[PDB]
Symmetry: D2
Subunit: 387 residues, 4 copies
Amino acid sequence: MREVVIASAARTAVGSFGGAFKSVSAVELGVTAAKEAIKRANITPDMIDESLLGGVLTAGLGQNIARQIALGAGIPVEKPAMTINIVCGSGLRSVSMASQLIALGDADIMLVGGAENMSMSPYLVPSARYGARMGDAAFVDSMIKDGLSDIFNNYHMGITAENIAEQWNITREEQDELALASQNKAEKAQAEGKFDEEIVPVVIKDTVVDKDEYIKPGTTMEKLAKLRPAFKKDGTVTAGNASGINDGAAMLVVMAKEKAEELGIEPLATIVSYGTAGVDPKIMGYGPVPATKKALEAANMTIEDIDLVEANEAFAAQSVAVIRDLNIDMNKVNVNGGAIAIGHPIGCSGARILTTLLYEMKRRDAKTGLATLCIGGGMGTTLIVKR
Amino acid sequence: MREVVIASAARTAVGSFGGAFKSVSAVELGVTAAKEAIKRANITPDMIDESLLGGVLTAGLGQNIARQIALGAGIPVEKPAMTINIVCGSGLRSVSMASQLIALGDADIMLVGGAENMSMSPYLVPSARYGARMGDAAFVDSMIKDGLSDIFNNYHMGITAENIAEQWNITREEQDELALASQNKAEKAQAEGKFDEEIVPVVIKDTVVDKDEYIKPGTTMEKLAKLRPAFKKDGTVTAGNASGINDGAAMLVVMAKEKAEELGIEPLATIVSYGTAGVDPKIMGYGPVPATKKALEAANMTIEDIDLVEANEAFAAQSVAVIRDLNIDMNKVNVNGGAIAIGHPIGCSGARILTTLLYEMKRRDAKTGLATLCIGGGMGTTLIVKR
Amino acid sequence: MREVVIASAARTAVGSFGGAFKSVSAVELGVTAAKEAIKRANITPDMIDESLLGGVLTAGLGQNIARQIALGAGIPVEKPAMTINIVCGSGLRSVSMASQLIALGDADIMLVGGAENMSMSPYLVPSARYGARMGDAAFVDSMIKDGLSDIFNNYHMGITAENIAEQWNITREEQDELALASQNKAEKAQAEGKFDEEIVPVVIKDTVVDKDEYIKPGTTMEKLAKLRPAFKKDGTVTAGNASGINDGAAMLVVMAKEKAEELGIEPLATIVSYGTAGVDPKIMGYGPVPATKKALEAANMTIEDIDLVEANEAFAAQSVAVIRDLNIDMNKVNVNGGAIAIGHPIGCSGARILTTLLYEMKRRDAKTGLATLCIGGGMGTTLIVKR
Amino acid sequence: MREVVIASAARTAVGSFGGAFKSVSAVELGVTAAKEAIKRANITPDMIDESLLGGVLTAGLGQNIARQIALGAGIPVEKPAMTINIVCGSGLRSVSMASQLIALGDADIMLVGGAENMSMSPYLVPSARYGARMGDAAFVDSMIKDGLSDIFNNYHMGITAENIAEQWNITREEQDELALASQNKAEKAQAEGKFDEEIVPVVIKDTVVDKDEYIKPGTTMEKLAKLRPAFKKDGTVTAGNASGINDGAAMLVVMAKEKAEELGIEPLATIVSYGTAGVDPKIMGYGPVPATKKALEAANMTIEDIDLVEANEAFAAQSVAVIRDLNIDMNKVNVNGGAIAIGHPIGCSGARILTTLLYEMKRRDAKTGLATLCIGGGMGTTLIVKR
């Protein structure tokens, strides 16, 4: 099995719900990020063998948005492209899965990552084809139905976070403390210029979007503590300690280690291992724990071997449980902030956090890193990298 | 790289648009087929490592229908599941891609295939979230937008068939002759009992659906010749010489050859090779040609080495071009009929035609077989098998 | 104040919900009836001074359907036309109100009546203009919201019928007995040809609709008694003892008595008096009682002076209460059946029952007659006529 | 025939489209105005015999908004209420029609006027009941379809204004001059306090709305001249020289002159005459001319006998034609501005302009006045009053 490297990465800024990218499609965001990821690898689009891209809320976008992104980025029509959906994990598992194909020898160079525009996701009318007949009918927000709710238990992803808060005894204050830290880390990182390298500007014909919109500077514990529960009466999970609804894309080039050598490409990192695992849908936020254990075992590593972690902040409640049960270094995870501050553009997020990880590892001169996400429906996915 | 076998296959009957499965969801169809594919492999659901399933028109179905099918079939919550979209090719590339993962050693046993309910696909309101403001607004059939039209050229898949009819000089009569033969082959096969083994009944709480609904017995050239063009004024492509709109699921168990040996499983076939390739979106129906050339080259085979072909009949116009340019045996392809007669439930079809191939190879005592499909957006995918 | 006569009347057959007029608009039905009412008066359309027409469920029909009907019937553009909405009473109060204008001297000849197509009434999206923002939204059947429910108490008109059943002690069996009689009277009248004169055929380009569709021959008490309550758990009101949902139009020509004399027109009847009155919305079905008392007082009559009654059968429960409290002759009311059998096309019904009254009075050689309807929102309206 | 007086009048401020009353329903606006009109007549709600109210865009508002307004204003359930639709004329013809009923002796005291909330008018789905079946479907703005377009010619009311501009040779500059004057007159009147008396505040639970929102102070000819045509390529009619889309209600109490005497009510004015007339739909904006000629003839008056005119400014193009052909005093019409500045809440406007007329007549000590409006579908309606 040959080794695989991550040659390059680029992401758009993450937009707020109804914000910067209210009218800039997932495909357009993806093309912007893909073109730049290709340039950052010192290759041309014709050198991509195939594309494998995450995207969840794809209703009304036309056939196969991965193909749309690939062709829009200038990749020839001869190269295949496919969209994948493992919900919140899609943008990261595209990377690991592509690495599987390349390790096997069936591709040398792939475009991977994910794209998501939650603002532009549509409403649905299930009765429209054959009729409602009589009486009021369903008129469904596809974002909630297909993206932000659990189908097995018919409740919001936020209720799965409440389930973890209750079972792991994670208090409101503990959740708010994590949220506060996320905001302040993101504020500080943004102001120090630490997102400048990874971001590619989006040009709207002109308006230039090059800053993460969702970060809330001057968040305080006093403000967070006043918020009402968002999902459950007398709950603990609030808008302030939950991830945002957001728009963005993030793209990477992966290739065989031997191909990077041939081409004289200095990669961001080498892929060490990966893992995807399941848990009960009711506690989906715990998914990163078995996924990460699997990935570490495959690498012959323990958490003590990992220098830097990106663990997606779907909800503070789940994030606290994951950090505690994996024995992660509490200030060596999401060191430039997480999704509570930066946002959670579902099918992009796994690629977004990997991009942030890789650029931070390089600037710190870290050796090893880990990206992991929880996944609606009860899964986790993880990627371990080294440089 | 280890060898991979197809342990088992099962499909539902294919329903007509608004017909047998008007109210039986893609997930319910998938669960029915998956449970039976698992039983036909002499394994239990806990023995599945992960599931990889095709599905295209998934709006309003909730998170990740592959996970829904897996859990509904009794596969434990610990096993991952992911949905893929390479349009019309999804149900076949799930099989080849799973084989890649198993060859590499990262899975031993997987549930693969696809599920699609076109009848139940919803209408969309793009302006619903932020408002239409003033004046009439878009109200979009997701089936047409996301399934049956080309996004690059903004026209129906049927126009891509007209493009091939014009460029390859495939006449109306030639298209109707293929359609006629498809109908009569399907009629004859159904009446002789040749679909009995592969089909699993769907039980609606009771009504039992166990017959392919869409076949039109007593089709004639006179009837076909009277039909009006469906897509283009003065065109050649009609409802009669085009695939149907349809509902169905088809599921298979794939596993390492060594695992089948261990378990004493007699497989339907061994996977020989695969290929996925691109063409211009305008001529998407030609995709099977480069895909199949790639697969044959990988196998060190020529078309002369292949005993039986399933080539999905998206449109007679494209099907004639594919058969002619691959030098396929004209009566050794779709020998029990094709999608003009049986239907084209988009994300299921690749798994549907593979199921029909495998059961026919076994009954004929054929040695080698090939399944291939054209793919909206300009692709093809192929799988070569041997027994 | 001068006297006013009803010169002529014509109605379409009443169609079933989703039936004969599923695709024949309220305006088209109205034009058919209006043209024939004009001919039955021995006048030309230019002789109409103005039109006043009922119609309730007018969403999406374009500006002012009375004007559409008038112009479609050939009435000159110079003649005004206006639509009125007093819900179920609209088609009758158009007649009385026109008579007020003519009595005063401000019109000599008017087109009156009503038109309604419940099948074609649309669904509504209240959030569409400014957006739903997030989460599922309302998708409203305008027929139920604007036609068949009480806005003050937010429940179906059928619940107002339950309120009367409870307060007046009208049993399920008593309701079913009235329904049975309605069906059998309608069956018998239709078969004997008694609707032949009043109906004008509707020609659909050809299909001719000339029979009341909704009548259920061979209704029996056994069948009625098996029906489930339609509106309230453990209720008394069922689909069988409630009015139908229906489509139809009915049009009349009214004119000053002196104008009919001048023109040598033999009128169907002379208007004696009218009345419109209110009750609590909760008991709207009782409206005919105060309305009729008012009309009788204005005429210096008692119910004993009335030879024939049409009292619209919105619900058997309310109809029994009205007949009992007005001391109506139980077999001198709705003698050819009522709306349980024939249907209730809301804005047409008042004109429909008046048309049936006038033709039956003439054939019986009756002298006096009365039409009355209950009205959603808590009203009744009545017209007394003589010949 | 007895004489009829206008005892009192009250109107809400007129809101901008999506503005002050974006969420304050037509019924709520109507109730506010009705309660105050009743108080301004020195009567109690139980003294109202019946209500007759205009309203056009009533989809989804529930049964019969006149009844809703009446009951909400405290009028007893015994008193009838009916909604009328003669499009733009509805709020004025309610007044004249009520006067007909009172002159005849069938009512002594009525609540009249109109209410309209264009912002809150819904979108419609004609195919929703029985289904769209396949392919995109209609999704219709009820405001445009039922309020702001001509059904006979299937084009916007603004095109009827272009038709008049062309046929009467009314230039862009002439239209803009009228618009400019409307804005400046309204600005000046508002600033001088001249709307203070007629307006009743709307209290939103608190926010108080008591100023006409739509007036554009500092409008200039330079600004107006830069606007693009709104309805026709190379047209003359723009957003600046057309009426607005707006929300509001206006209510009046009318009663027999002898009843006002009995009660010691000093009326705003006595009704002299009225008229409603038709023209071709294509030139609907001309309707006021025959309507006004009819009203003047009935009064034995000429335009020279009229001291003050309110002629609704649907479009400057039509307004210029009406003023010129009626020989109106150019600065004795809309002396406090018109609908270009103040707005055109369709079913309210006739009552709105009458309210403004009556209060201005009183403050000027004028003797005679005239209100007139053009009406979509090709009509006009007029009321002449004296004090």
